[PDB]
Ligand binder design. Structure first.
Ligand SMILES: *[C@@H](CS(C)(=O)=O)[C@H](Cc1ccc(CN)cc1)NC(=O)[C@@H](NC(=O)[C@H](CC(C)C)NC(=O)[C@@H](Cc1ccccc1)N=[N+]=[N-])[C@@H](C)O
Ligand SMILES: *[C@@H](CS(C)(=O)=O)[C@H](Cc1ccc(CN)cc1)NC(=O)[C@@H](NC(=O)[C@H](CC(C)C)NC(=O)[C@@H](Cc1ccccc1)N=[N+]=[N-])[C@@H](C)O
Ligand SMILES: [Mg+2]
Ligand SMILES: [Mg+2]
Ligand SMILES: [Mg+2]
Ligand SMILES: [Mg+2]
Lengths: 212, 226, 204, 195, 196, 233, 222, 196, 195
């Protein structure tokens, strides 16, 4: 599991891998680790598959109830805090979640909140979560600037997940990309690592450690 | 594993299934659990497979050297005594459970040996995870003065009981018949009740299906020479 | 903690018509961290091939040990060791470390130079021999390989067909194991020619 | 000991090794050299349990230096790494094993090639274009996967190494007090005094 | 296991059940627990079968070598050799042995050697898991200088009760009679002893 | 969570052409002590069902009372209590299976293995197992404890699959059960010679046989067995 | 100490076709090295053209299926006999499973049916209710043996067009019901050979627009 | 502890030793383990003294309240109340109780309630640590419809052996006779029973 | 959370708190403010177990802000610290205690005096001239014992605090990514943006 989200000039990039494991058994290569809470809100999933999927789906219901009651879109801060206050009630029971709540609102601008199952809630510009986080951080921190093109930022997020997919045994399958703007989130496709890796190797001239 | 031994009119017979396992997976569908010690002394093995194999081979080797030294046919009690003293020494850490049977100048014999070095004498015995299934059959049908034809039937039935009802046991039935005044006859794949059925499809691929990065010839010979 | 699944990797061997095939992945890791994508697990001593999965320090140590022993064998016997004899040598050498064993899953493959008979064998970490007509599997994705082999395999395959079968058995098994993959090698072995092929596979 | 990196470029091997020595609560030293010269063209960096690291390094150093005097000849990096691996592989089944991981960077004067070997405390040897031990690799391998080329110069190798150290200084929790960097090439071993 | 040795006028009788269990499974229902270390020195074995067999085999070896050099050993001597093995290896053994033998000088003698490796010379002895259930019965019904027929009945009735209550005991009641006349083996089947 | 104290061993059973047979010995063991020799572990419910119970005897006695109370409760405001609204084997089983699974789910199980044998309204054979975990299964032969390991192999030689049930008569089935009980007496250290057997037939009804004994026992071969290897005397 | 869980073995397999779906399972039920039953049905028709199996600990599996069947019944009562769609069934099963997050159902659950466009659908759940729609899924003891084979034969993984070097993948196709059943039968025959807990019989439930049909095949009894 | 209840022609007799131990120290050498829950329904207590006293006190309360409403309770009813407490609180109790009583309709009855909380109606019952040593003796010597003098001797001889072999048992042998004639207490001292 | 310091000078209280947030392997953030304003002249810094720290701080903040609205009055630093202590002292015998240590720096507008309170997760309160939680005090108290005077200016207090932070950066193993410094005086709370 490698998930990442970073803020830049043109909004937020969100990229995740698509692998789920039971120990060393690769259960799936086609898992969805991004939940579309609404047209302006995204949640990323790391840790327990069930815990994330259940509570982030529940979060979407709570975000919907907010906009029915208040006639207004829920803030990223408020949405992230509903989830963080929930997991905090369950603290010690053994929930396992590492998550990022990413969205745009007019009052906040583009915002990313890291939330996890031991109750931590952090606002920030860059986050990587999961067993492959360190690998993603390596690529991301080196080529990160505030003012990337949307095209370059989408590539960096994709490339950072690829880097982790390669090195981290528990990350892989495919890369799912999102871009969050003023107008909402936009899906930028599912990219199979088995085809992407070779494509990137040839075009970029990277991965010289590999027999190709 | 289902191994068994029983005596009949002028001999002793051993039986064994042919399944080797690693926890829940079947490693081998045709393995020989009836080990050779001497020409007319055989050993059914259960427990740790390497241990049962190693301990029978070692005692078989020492029995051969003893036989040469003494100019005599080896006795089953010698194999028994040597096996138990070895196993006792290691305090069960060699996890071999054995049924030893054979013919010698004293007569026909049938013993069992446990991993800690205890031995039993019996007219019919069974060991391994299928021992209870086998012993149920042996307790129902064994009698004194069995003919060879009845003995092979009963032994194979006892092993079959284990094959069908025990998950640890399976595949085929091996038998070894040791009769007085005759060559021991070893009957591997005596029964074959578990042949795999013909498959629905052939999964043979079109050639070039697999993507290949490099090819090279391996030099396996000594010295390419001038 | 479990030594046989720290480094990861797999070996599979198959028989065909007047040929054998042995294949392995190329990964070496420290649990989740991938370290090397060039760690070959198949070695050869004359015409006898040995694949070894398990703890990588023991894979290397045993290769060096069997090179040592087969070199001395050849000097004294004045001929290369045969697969049937080498199988017994592997078993002997593993069992002598019964109470402090090497954490490995060896696989012997080769053609007997005199009889021309294809031969494969597998072992547990303490030397119990599994001599198979059809195929042998080993490593962290052994369950996956058992499933692939048991359905894909048919007897008496020609060398170039057998290559496709063993390759597809390895590749699809490796892709369902976190600790295997990162490249693969397949040896096709005939009585007096051996072809080695590196496979293109997904690098995650 | 914490971070040890290695990178093999066109004509040299570069080893970077952290300076901090921490015993529990306090940082006792911030200028520790976690390396020994085994022969004029072979350098070994090391990290692991306190005491065992230096004891092992110096023991290897003495044996290689003894070989050099006896034969009036420098062992190849490959031969040294095989010797080191066997000592660790012997160690792991001892009463008390050496808990030491090493990188061996050497220039093979016969083949005119730099060579980098990574060996862990179990005796697990691998030849690599770039290597690390412990948690360092989790951050640095993804960078090196991206930026590495086999035909890089020594200056390009040092710039790529600065990028690795910056990433470690950003994302690792422990203050490892910077790195001592050493280059191994055809002319021998030298220390980059400003890094 | 239910085992006992009883001295009487003409000598001594050893008695035992025939059940060997691995947990609740009966591994052998026709075991012979009365074992010969010398012509007229026998023992009853309880505890680890491996341990008691290994000991008995060593004692038989020692007494055979004793006989070659010094002539027939006393029952006391046999008990001492059993003791020496049991006591010195007490940390690695689970053996409870009753030694019984016939001299012409000393007549019938019984020695019991429990877990610790102590020796106790007694008129009769009981041991094994099933013995707990017959302490009361045996104490009330034992007399010194019984006849052969009385001693056979005493053992048969005693072990019948031990078998009845102990799950670890069962099968046939084997006995071995040791007198000047020689060595007699007796067997008694369930249909005989259960109805007592 | 508890541990079983006074226990009952194997219950064995099988289907035959017109009904079912079930059997169990009359022993209540207290560990290795064969404490209680008169314990009935087959408990009939009406004239169409027998519940055979192994495991903890105090929990068995509780279940016995639940079944007795169930018959009472079914009779309440039920003019057809002895006819179309009588208790079926399937009703009695499902009740017990519910209880067993509920009790395990509160971490306080009834420490038993239960076999419900009977004949339904339409003449169909009923035979189903349930245990302390709430695990349930049906098969032409069923057995608990040591019976699973020793009786099933013998009973499966008579009825190996569903199609063998119409071919099996009550004499053949009872013979197989009685032989299996002898085998268990030879080999189970916590069994007894005395047992009860129940036949539930669709034509002849419920036949309950008490105070049966294992007979025709082979012990004679024991006299020739001497020592543990080398002993001749 | 009392252990509330057990392992009854078995293996199950769901495959989604173009206008059909199959859910297969072996009929063997075991504990440790003993066979409990050679024919104990594990795959159930739940109504509304949905088939379900919960493989693992059979008591938890039976409980879950029983609760889902009841959930279908109450969905009809509460929503005017409306057909429970396969996607709605799946979400309902997640909540059933997650309700016992801190005392789980020890089962791997698979359901099969048709989606609201008439296309074949398979859904698969972990023990605590994480789920995913899949084209292909094996669960239980021999899942590790069967899944790689299905990756290769159903989804055509690692297979390339001959002569293209290795740059055109074998194109994805829907299989016929006859082809799927051949792959199901060969998967279970193979799994029976190498896994001791798999055998006795194979029961396949096929779901089409016409309804739920059954097929039974003998497997090796050793 | 050695305790027993024995039915006979005229009714039932309960018997017990008088030793209470804390480890190897004898905390009380003159304990009364025969305790009254109703006029002619008594019980023998074994296991935790606190637990058996707490139970017996509750049963006495229940049977007193039963008697106020419904008249004299049966021995079966008393055993059922004991069972209900023992079975429902099996996780927190260590109680092994023998219940014995005299009706005129049912005459002498004995019920034993071991650790699990099961009930077993028997002609006679034995329990406590010292009972293991007299299973054999009691089975061989018990007859149905004995006289009062025979039953007193049977209990005296039995508990004498239990006391002899069990360290946890000892002191005086107390007995309580339950017949139509009434309730008689008997005591037997060491100098009497040891020489049997 | 790692290092929190506090120093009470003549006319103000200065709280310094580390910026790093580390979850195991990685440093997730390097700009975290480990403090909440409880009232205009009362600041509380905090450190301890993840989640519990912020949950507790914000819970205290809400209660003090509720008091302020209800009475239209600011509670004294002493009163706030006693409230906080009781909440922690209640917590320690709960099903799941708050694992949070705090410093409360406040300016008492009635007495015209700065006040620093140190309270640990058990509810152990002490008024101090200077305070710290966790391993920070092991290094910093010896400095403050040497250099502290009660009549120091705020600028002298900040210089003394730089000397504390430099010592921590030299001798502590963890990289705590510098400190956010805040001053509490008669005019309220302000952040020193360059440190
Ligand atoms: C990677 C997270 S990691 C290993 O920490 O880097 C992924 C992320 C992820 C996020 C969302 C989703 C949504 N479907 C999937 C994956 N997480 C995992 O792989 C976790 N895996 C699981 O939770 C798996 C999931 C199944 C589908 C394989 N399940 C289990 O690990 C256990 C659950 C279980 C519960 C009770 C009793 C027994 C088992 N089971 N199985 N089988 C991560 C934990 O690996
Ligand atoms: C049945 C034994 S049972 C199930 O206990 O009744 C068979 C008996 C047997 C005897 C001999 C031979 C061949 N000569 C085959 C079978 N035993 C087994 O199948 C054993 N299997 C093993 O021992 C396997 C064998 C390998 C070849 C699959 N080895 C292991 O399972 C373990 C062995 C091991 C044990 C202790 C320490 C290290 C290793 N290993 N691995 N890896 C029986 C164990 O199941
Ligand atoms: Mg990977
Ligand atoms: Mg892989
Ligand atoms: Mg008995
Ligand atoms: Mg099978």
């Amino acid at each position: 599991t490698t998930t990442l989200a970073f803020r830049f000039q043109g909004g937020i990039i969100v990229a995740v891998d698509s692998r789920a494991t039971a120990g060393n058994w690769v259960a799936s290569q086609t898992v969805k680790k991004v939940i579309e809470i609404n047209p302006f809100l995204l949640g990323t999933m790391a840790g327990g598959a069930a815990d994330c999927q259940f509570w982030e789906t529940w979060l979407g219901s709570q975000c919907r109830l907010h906009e029915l009651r208040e006639k207004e879109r829920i803030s990223v801060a408020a949405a992230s805090k509903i989830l963080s206050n929930l997991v905090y009630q369950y603290k010690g029971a053994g929930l396992s979640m590492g998550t990022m709540i990413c969205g745009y609102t007019r009052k906040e601008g583009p915002t990313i909140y890291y939330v996890d199952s031991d109750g931590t809630r952090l606002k920030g510009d860059i986050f990587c979560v999961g067993s492959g986080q360190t690998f993603a951080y390596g690529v991301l921190d080196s080529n990160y600037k505030w003012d990337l093109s949307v095209e370059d930022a989408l590539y960096l997020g994709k490339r950072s997940i690829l880097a982790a997919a390669h090195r981290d045994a528990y990350s892989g399958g495919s890369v799912n990309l999102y871009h969050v703007t003023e107008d909402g989130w936009i899906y930028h496709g599912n990219h199979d690592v088995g085809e992407l890796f070779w494509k990137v190797k040839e075009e970029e001239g990277s991965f010289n450690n590999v027999i190709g | 594993t289902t191994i068994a031994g029983l005596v009949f009119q002028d001999g002793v017979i051993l039986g064994a299934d042919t399944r080797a396992t690693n926890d829940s997976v079947v490693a081998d569908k045709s393995c020989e659990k009836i080990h050779f010690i001497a020409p007319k002394i055989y050993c059914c093995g259960a427990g740790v497979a390497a241990d049962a194999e190693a301990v029978t081979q070692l005692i078989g080797s020492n029995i051969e050297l003893h036989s040469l030294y003494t100019s005599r046919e080896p006795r089953v009690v010698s194999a028994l005594q040597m096996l138990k003293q070895h196993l006792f020494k290691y305090q069960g850490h060699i996890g071999a459970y054995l049924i030893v049977a054979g013919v010698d100048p004293t007569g026909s014999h049938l013993f069992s040996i446990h991993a800690h070095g205890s031995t039993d004498v019996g007219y019919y015995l069974s060991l391994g995870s299928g021992s209870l299934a086998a012993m149920a059959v042996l307790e129902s049908h064994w009698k004194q003065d069995l003919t060879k034809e009845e003995a092979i039937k009963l032994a194979s039935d006892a092993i079959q009981a284990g094959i069908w009802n025990d998950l640890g046991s399976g595949s085929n039935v091996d038998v070894c018949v040791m009769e007085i005044g005759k060559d021991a006859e070893y009957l591997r794949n005596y029964l074959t009740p578990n042949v795999r059925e013909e498959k629905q499809k052939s999964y043979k691929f079109p050639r070039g299906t697999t993507a290949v990065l490099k090819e090279s010839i391996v030099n396996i010979c000594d010295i390419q020479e001038e | 903690s479990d030594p046989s699944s720290i480094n990861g990797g797999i070996v599979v061997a198959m028989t065909g018509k007047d040929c054998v095939a042995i294949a392995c992945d190329l990964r070496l890791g420290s649990q989740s961290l991938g370290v090397s994508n060039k760690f070959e697990k198949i070695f050869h001593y004359g015409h006898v091939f040995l694949g070894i999965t398990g703890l990588a320090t023991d894979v290397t140590t045993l290769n060096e040990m069997f090179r040592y022993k087969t070199n001395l064998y050849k000097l004294k016997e004045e001929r290369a060791i045969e697969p049937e004899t080498f199988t017994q040598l592997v078993s002997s050498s593993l069992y002598e470390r019964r109470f402090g064993p090497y954490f490995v899953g060896p696989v012997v493959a080769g053609i007997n130079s005199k009889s021309g008979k294809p031969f494969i064998a597998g072992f547990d970490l303490i030397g119990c021999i599994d001599e198979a007509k059809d195929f042998i599997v080993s490593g962290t994705a052994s369950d996956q390989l058992f499933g692939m082999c048991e359905s894909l395999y048919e007897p008496n395959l020609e060398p170039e067909d057998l290559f496709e079968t063993i390759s597809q058995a390895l590749l699809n098994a490796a892709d369902r194991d976190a600790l295997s993959g990162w490249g693969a090698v397949v040896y096709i072995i005939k009585k007096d020619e051996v072809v080695k092929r590196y496979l293109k596979m997904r690098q995650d | 000991m914490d971070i040890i990196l290695g990178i093999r470029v066109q004509d040299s091997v570069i080893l970077a090794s952290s300076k901090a020595v921490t015993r529990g609560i306090s940082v006792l030293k911030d200028s520790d050299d976690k390396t020994r010269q085994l022969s004029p063209h072979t350098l070994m960096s090391f990290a692991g349990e306190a005491g065992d690291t230096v004891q092992f390094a110096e023991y290897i150093q003495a044996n290689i230096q003894l070989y050099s005097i006896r034969e009036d000849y420098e062992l190849s990096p490959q031969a040294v790494s095989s010797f080191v691996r066997q000592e660790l592989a012997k160690s792991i089944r001892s009463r008390r094993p050496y808990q030491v991981n090493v990188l061996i960077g050497g220039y093979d004067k016969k083949k005119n090639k730099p060579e980098l070997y990574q060996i862990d405390y179990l005796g697990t040897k691998v030849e690599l274009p770039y290597g690390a031990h412990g948690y360092s690799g989790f951050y640095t391998f993804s960078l090196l996967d991206h930026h590495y080329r086999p035909d890089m110069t020594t200056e390009e190798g040092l710039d790529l190494l600065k990028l690795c150290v910056q990433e470690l200084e950003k994302r690792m929790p422990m203050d490892f007090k910077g790195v001592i960097v050493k280059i191994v090439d055809k002319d021998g071993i030298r220390q980059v005094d400003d890094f | 296991t239910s085992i006992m040795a009883v001295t009487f006028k003409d000598g001594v009788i050893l008695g035992a059940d025939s059940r060997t269990t691995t947990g609740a499974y009966i591994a052998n229902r026709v075991t012979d627990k009365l074992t010969r270390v010398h012509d007229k020195i026998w023992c009853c074995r309880s505890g680890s079968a491996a341990d008691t067999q290994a000991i008995a085999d060593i004692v038989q070896y020692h007494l055979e070598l004793y006989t070659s050099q010094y002539g027939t050993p006393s029952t006391e001597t046999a008990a001492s050799v059993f003791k020496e093995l049991c006591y010195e290896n007490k940390d690695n053994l689970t053996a409870g042995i009753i030694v019984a033998g016939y001299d012409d000088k000393n007549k019938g003698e019984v020695y019991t050697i429990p877990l610790g490796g102590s020796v106790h010379k007694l008129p009769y002895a009981i041991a094994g898991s099933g013995s707990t259930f017959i302490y009361g019965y045996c104490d009330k019904n034992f007399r010194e200088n019984m006849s052969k027929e009385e001693t056979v009945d005493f053992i048969k009735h005693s072990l019948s009760q031990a078998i009845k209550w102990d799950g670890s005991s069962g099968g046939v009641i084997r006995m071995v009679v040791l007198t000047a006349a020689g060595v007699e083996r007796l067997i008694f089947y369930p249909d005989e002893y259960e109805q007592l | 969570t508890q541990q079983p104290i006074v226990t009952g061993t194997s219950v064995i059973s099988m289907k035959y052409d017109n009904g079912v047979i079930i059997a169990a010995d009359n022993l209540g063991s207290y560990g290795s002590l064969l404490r209680f020799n008169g314990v009935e572990r087959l408990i009939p419910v009406g004239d169409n069902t027998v519940v055979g119970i192994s495991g903890d005897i105090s929990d068995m006695q509780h279940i016995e009372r639940l079944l007795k109370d169930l018959v009472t409760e079914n009779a309440y405001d039920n003019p057809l209590a002895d006819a179309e609204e009588a208790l079926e084997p399937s009703y009695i089983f499902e009740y017990l299976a519910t209880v067993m699974y509920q009790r395990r789910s509160k971490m306080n199980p009834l420490w038993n293995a239960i076999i419900v044998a009977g004949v339904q309204s339409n003449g169909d054979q009923f035979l189903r197992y349930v245990n302390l975990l709430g695990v349930t299964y049906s098969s032409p032969t069923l057995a608990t404890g040591f019976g699973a390991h020793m009786a099933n192999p013998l009973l499966r030689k008579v009825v190996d699959r569903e199609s063998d049930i119409p071919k099996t008569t009550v004499q053949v089935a009872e013979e197989a059960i009685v032989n299996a009980m002898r085998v268990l007496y030879y080999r189970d250290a916590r069994s007894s010679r005395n047992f009860s057997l129940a036949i539930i037939d669709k034509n002849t009804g419920l036949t309950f046989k008490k105070n049966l004994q294992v007979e025709n026992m082979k012990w004679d071969f024991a006299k020739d067995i001497k020592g543990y290897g080398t002993q001749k005397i | 100490q009392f252990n509330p869980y057990g392992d009854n073995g078995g293996t199950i397999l769901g495959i989604a076709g173009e206008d059909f779906a199959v859910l297969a399972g072996d009929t063997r039920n075991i504990t440790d090295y003993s066979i409990n039953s050679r024919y104990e049905p594990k795959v159930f028709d739940c109504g509304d053209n949905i088939v379900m199996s919960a493989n693992g600990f059979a008591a938890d599996g039976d409980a879950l299926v029983k609760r889902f069947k009841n959930s279908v019944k109450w969905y009809h009562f509460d929503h005017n006999d409306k057909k429970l769609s396969i996607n709605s069934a799946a979400r309902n099963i997640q909540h059933l499973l997650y309700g016992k997050r801190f005392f789980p159902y020890y089962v791997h659950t698979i359901i099969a049916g048709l989606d609201e466009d008439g296309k074949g659908a398979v859904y698969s759940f972990d023990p605590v209710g994480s789920y995913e729609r899949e084209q292909c899924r094996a669960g239980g003891a021999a899942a590790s043996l069967i899944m790689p084979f299905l990756d290769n034969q159903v989804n055509f993984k690692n297979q390339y067009e001959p002569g293209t070097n290795g740059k055109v993948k074998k194109p994805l196709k829907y299989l016929s019901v006859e082809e799927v059943i051949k792959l199901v039968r060969d998967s279970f025959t193979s799994a029976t050979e190498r896994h001791i807990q798999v055998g006795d019989g194979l029961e396949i439930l096929i779901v089409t627009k016409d309804g739920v049909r059954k097929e039974f095949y003998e497997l090796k009894r050793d």
